[PDB]
Design a protein around this ligand. Structure first.
Ligand SMILES: NC(=O)c1ccc[n+]([C@@H]2O[C@H](COP(=O)([O-])OP(=O)(O)OC[C@H]3O[C@@H](n4cnc5c(N)ncnc54)[C@H](OP(=O)(O)O)[C@@H]3O)[C@@H](O)[C@H]2O)c1
Ligand SMILES: O=C(O)Cc1nn(Cc2nc3cc(C(F)(F)F)ccc3s2)c(=O)c2ccccc12
Ligand code: NA
Length: 318
């Protein structure tokens, strides 16, 4: 039995510092993955409408609660609002489908998945005659206002953002009539993209950071052979070998020691367990400084041609 350390949010709620990622977790395999995770002691599950497996995640959670392996109050479930649903009636609807699929009566955190709004419709990635993203009318500011109502009604404990630059967070924080603040900013983070300035900014505002693709997302479709590879990095493995841990475990522990929440994905039971056995060792300061020095500003998660739309986040330095 394992328990991830808690990171305290500005709402005083306690967010487990390690969680289970579920993107690319196939139907069939994801339900068992969630169950294994829960038995191992995971309490934080990272989900999303756009991952299209929330119902199987729902099945697993429901079955675990019923068989009394875990209570709802101790689970920490996060999901996200996809950019094609920023318009107010759509925000409520998408949230309702997410909540239904997950068989929950409330979410612990509901995130804006990406800052840029997309054209509404029966289409997740609307594009033009080329492959250019088509933007929508409603902005993340519009969306947030609708999301704030979910909090007012007790349907969501807290709100957050994902893939936001500090400029975009500045925009949200200075928004007139702001009712709720983001408790986290979920962004790609790993030794090739250390996010030093964005983490500094977020923490200075009482906003935690959730590190996604911490293993370099080797199963991302668009991966290309020349693309860097964290898990195969010999310097990483070298440090791993020293602590009698795997490369993955070092890549997870890295975030823990920056007080950054981290959500590695796996559907392999052995790996799921391995990924949470990271509270029995420490990386030295020298090791941390070394790992930080690997920064290459390389984004594994940057495949969509969307730099023309107004709220594209990665043009900003941070
Ligand atoms: N925009 C966003 O908000 C956003 C974007 C990307 C990701 N995320 C979230 O963050 C999660 C993690 O990111 P990601 O899924 O891109 O990638 P990731 O966690 O960096 O890497 C997942 C890959 O690593 C493998 N793996 C897992 N544990 C391992 C271990 N101990 N040793 C070796 N290989 C291991 C997995 O294999 P198996 O499954 O075959 O074991 C899988 O192929 C996502 O699932 C999602 O929840 C959010
Ligand atoms: O979404 C995940 O969790 C993983 C994720 N990432 N990406 C890369 C993306 N790049 C974006 C850029 C914008 C932008 F805001 F920049 F316009 C908006 C939306 C996206 S999706 C995908 O293309 C994708 C496809 C299916 C399922 C998940 C994903
Ligand atoms: Na990492």
């Amino acid at each position: 039995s394992h328990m991830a350390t808690f990171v305290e949010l500005s709402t005083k709620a306690k967010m487990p510092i390690v969680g289970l990622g579920t993107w690319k977790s196939p139907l069939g395999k994801v339900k068992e993955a969630v169950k294994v995770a829960i038995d191992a002691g995971y309490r934080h599950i990272d989900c999303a409408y756009v991952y299209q497996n929330e119902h199987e995640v729902g099945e697993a959670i429901q079955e675990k609660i019923q068989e009394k392996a875990v209570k709802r109050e101790d689970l920490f479930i996060v999901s996200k609002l996809w950019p094609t649903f920023f318009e107010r009636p759509l925000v409520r609807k998408a949230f309702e489908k997410t909540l239904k699929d997950l068989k929950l009566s409330y979410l612990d955190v509901y995130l804006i998945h990406w800052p840029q709004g997309f054209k509404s419709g029966d289409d997740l990635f609307p594009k033009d005659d080329k492959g250019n993203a088509i933007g929508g009318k409603a902005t993340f500011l519009d969306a947030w206002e609708a999301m704030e109502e979910l909090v007012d009604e007790g349907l969501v404990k807290a709100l957050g953002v994902s893939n936001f630059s500090h400029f975009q967070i500045e925009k949200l924080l200075n928004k007139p009539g702001l009712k709720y603040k983001p408790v986290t900013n979920q962004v790609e983070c790993h030794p090739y993209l250390t996010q030093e300035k964005l983490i500094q900014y977020c923490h200075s505002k009482g906003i935690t950071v959730t590190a996604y693709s911490p293993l370099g997302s080797p199963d991302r479709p668009w991966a290309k052979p020349e693309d860097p590879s964290l898990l195969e990095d010999p310097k990483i493995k070298e440090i791993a070998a020293k602590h009698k841990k795997t490369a993955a475990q070092v890549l997870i522990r890295f975030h823990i020691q920056r007080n950054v929440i981290v959500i590695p994905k796996s559907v392999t039971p052995a790996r799921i367990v391995e990924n949470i056995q990271v509270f029995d060792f420490k990386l030295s300061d020298e090791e941390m400084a070394t790992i930080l020095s690997f920064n290459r500003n390389w984004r594994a998660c940057n495949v969509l041609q969307s730099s023309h739309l107004e709220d594209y986040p990665f043009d900003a330095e941070y």
